[PDB]
Scaffold this motif. Structure first.
Motif, mmCIF file in Angstrom:
data_model
loop_
_atom_site.group_PDB
_atom_site.id
_atom_site.type_symbol
_atom_site.label_atom_id
_atom_site.label_comp_id
_atom_site.label_asym_id
_atom_site.label_seq_id
_atom_site.Cartn_x
_atom_site.Cartn_y
_atom_site.Cartn_z
ATOM 1 N N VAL A 85 4.599 -1.558 3.119
ATOM 2 C CA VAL A 85 4.081 -0.267 2.650
ATOM 3 C C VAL A 85 5.176 0.470 1.930
ATOM 4 O O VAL A 85 6.344 0.290 2.252
ATOM 5 C CB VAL A 85 3.634 0.583 3.843
ATOM 6 N N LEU A 116 -3.472 1.055 8.799
ATOM 7 C CA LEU A 116 -3.478 0.167 7.654
ATOM 8 C C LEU A 116 -4.731 -0.785 7.598
ATOM 9 O O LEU A 116 -4.877 -1.563 6.649
ATOM 10 C CB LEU A 116 -2.151 -0.607 7.620
ATOM 11 N N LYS A 173 0.852 -1.190 0.000
ATOM 12 C CA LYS A 173 0.000 0.000 0.000
ATOM 13 C C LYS A 173 0.891 1.244 0.000
ATOM 14 O O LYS A 173 1.921 1.282 0.701
ATOM 15 C CB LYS A 173 -0.883 0.025 1.237
#
Ligand SMILES: NC(=O)c1ccc[n+]([C@@H]2O[C@H](COP(=O)([O-])OP(=O)(O)OC[C@H]3O[C@@H](n4cnc5c(N)ncnc54)[C@H](O)[C@@H]3O)[C@@H](O)[C@H]2O)c1
Ligand SMILES: NC(=O)c1ccc[n+]([C@@H]2O[C@H](COP(=O)([O-])OP(=O)(O)OC[C@H]3O[C@@H](n4cnc5c(N)ncnc54)[C@H](O)[C@@H]3O)[C@@H](O)[C@H]2O)c1
Lengths: 310, 308
Positions: free
Chosen positions: B25, B307, B2
């Motif tokens: 991430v 998250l 992400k």
């Protein structure tokens, strides 16, 4: 696969740096031993104010041996023009910081060596500051490397304090294992002798069976070597250090452009006359050739490196 | 992986990033360039560069190097003109002079520090932060504002034509999560958000937008603020579409920590849930702080909460 000849080089600032930049390309293992007696410039302020050895000559030697991106090399050579901060070299400041962290100048130098991918061992002449003193002909003493040439008198000799100044153990091992021992290039009184006069270093050089080459200055320096011939330089080394220190003297025995002479005459510097009869009389060999380039007058690191090995 | 973009300044951003980098991430950190105190400030004035301090700390938080090189970068000279300066600042200052470009200097230091993520300055030139007080007077400079002993009405930035980096705007466009804070409301978060174009980019984004709310008040900046007071200030300066959820430490704090903070006229930020709900945002409340005798976010918990 290759037997790399072990070479140890003694010097200071720009002469050592120019030579090492070329010598490192040859099949040799280099140990550079660098004077820690300077007290001018950024180096000198940091020396006084942080109580560490002057890092400047070491910094230049590290850059000469480094293998890093051009940008990191510039970063390390960056010099602040504004700020307290103004005048300081960032590479000096790095060395300062690492020395504070480790409490040990030699460990700091070896940590920076890893960071800069240095091929070779760089050692300081001592792990503590050295103070250089000059005895003049009149008997008076001038103290401090950068003050000695400003005395406007003739040097009789130089000597170091503290008297119990110690070289690094690693330095002495390097001399013991050396196949070639190179002295210079650099100021006679302010780089070469402050290295050689560290207690134990002459003794180690004398006991060594390595070939010992002195790279003679190409130009005189005002307030240091006014009027010196090549034999005058060698004589000064012998008077301070005794026998078994120099086997051959390497000299630029060919002429110099008139433009370069002119430029150096403005600083009361002139070519070092090569007096071959007097040099042979001092009992050493002479390696004479075209050994300088105009870049300012510097040694040709390639030709010199190759002459010291062939 | 992400894409996460984080807006902050000094220690709050550094503590979070040290933990967040361990998650799956891709991190972009956008760091205020409005500070004018300390070594950062002196270099800012004297070398005419953006203040390097908050960026230095972010770079160390994201670095992957031997402990010795990390200490070197964080070394602070105690003697010398030189005294007080951070060697890492001096490194950034030197790189910026060579490249003539703060963002490129940061990117070069990122490579040297094997940084995991993109670190960007809020702008490639210094920003000056101004505070308008309730009485209408203006106090200029990040480090002067809190010393005014008046109540802040609002802050704003000059030069007016201050520009964010193109790479910053792209980062917001591509973000899956946008994190605002943690950091001082008036001297870290707002100076980032107020850069022309940033709020517009955030509003256009469909990423989830989380505000990490201050745990403690700061004297001269947020005296007496509740959580809703902090969010309201962000809304009054930035409008709608900037914060979706507010993340708050809703649990108590040790008495010894409270006492230590009360010495600096700082106190816990009261979490007022009804007023927060009324501002139209979600509330993520948990035990989110750890105690030195200093109070910091728990990077792991916070990272995991944002998250989810
Ligand atoms: N660098 C070398 O390979 C080289 C070679 C042989 C000998 N040396 C000797 O080392 C001694 C000390 O050398 P140095 O580092 O002071 O260099 P230098 O004598 O060539 O020049 C002096 C220094 O100050 C500046 N400078 C002063 N006068 C200059 C001049 N007239 N032209 C150009 N630059 C000048 C330069 O920055 C230089 O570093 C000198 O006697 C020199 O001959 C150097
Ligand atoms: N770092 C984080 O994860 C974090 C978490 C929550 C909130 N914040 C907020 O960001 C704002 C500014 O942060 P900050 O960096 O000034 O942190 P801070 O509010 O905890 O303390 C102020 C600064 O000076 C020191 N300090 C001052 N007073 C202290 C106290 N009495 N006890 C212990 N240390 C003290 C701290 O180390 C810190 O750098 C504050 O409102 C703070 O609550 C940061």
């Amino acid at each position: 696969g290759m037997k790399k000849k072990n070479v140890i080089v003694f010097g200071g600032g720009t002469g050592l740096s120019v030579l090492l930049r070329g010598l490192k390309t040859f099949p040799v293992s280099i140990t550079a031993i660098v004077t820690v007696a300077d007290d001018g410039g950024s180096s000198g302020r940091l020396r006084k104010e942080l109580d560490i050895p002057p890092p400047g000559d070491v910094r230049n030697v590290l850059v000469a041996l480094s293998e890093v991106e051009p940008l990191l090399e510039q970063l390390f050579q960056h010099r602040f023009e504004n700020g307290g901060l103004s005048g300081h070299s960032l590479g000096n400041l790095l060395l300062a910081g690492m020395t504070s962290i480790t409490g040990d100048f030699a460990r700091g130098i070896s940590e920076m060596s890893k960071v800069l991918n240095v091929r070779g061992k760089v050692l300081p002449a001592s792990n503590r500051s050295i103070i250089l003193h000059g005895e003049m002909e009149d008997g008076t003493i001038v103290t401090g490397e950068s003050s000695i040439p400003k005395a406007g008198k003739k040097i009789k000799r130089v000597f170091l304090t503290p008297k119990d100044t110690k070289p690094l153990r690693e330095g002495l091992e390097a001399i013991r294992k050396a196949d070639v021992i190179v002295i210079g290039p650099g100021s006679l009184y302010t780089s070469v002798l402050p290295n050689l006069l560290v207690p134990g270093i002459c003794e180690a050089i004398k006991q060594s069976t390595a070939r010992k080459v002195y790279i003679c200055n190409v130009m005189t320096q005002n307030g240091e070597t006014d009027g010196y011939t090549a034999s005058d330089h060698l004589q000064a080394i012998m008077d301070h250090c005794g026998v078994g220190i120099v086997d051959d003297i390497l000299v630029h025995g060919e002429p110099i452009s008139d433009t370069v002479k002119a430029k150096y005459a403005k600083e009361k510097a002139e070519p070092v006359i090569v007096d071959e009869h007097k040099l042979k009389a001092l009992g050493v060999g002479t390696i004479s050739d075209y050994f300088v380039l105009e870049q300012v007058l510097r040694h040709n690191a390639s030709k010199v490196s190759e002459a010291i090995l062939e």
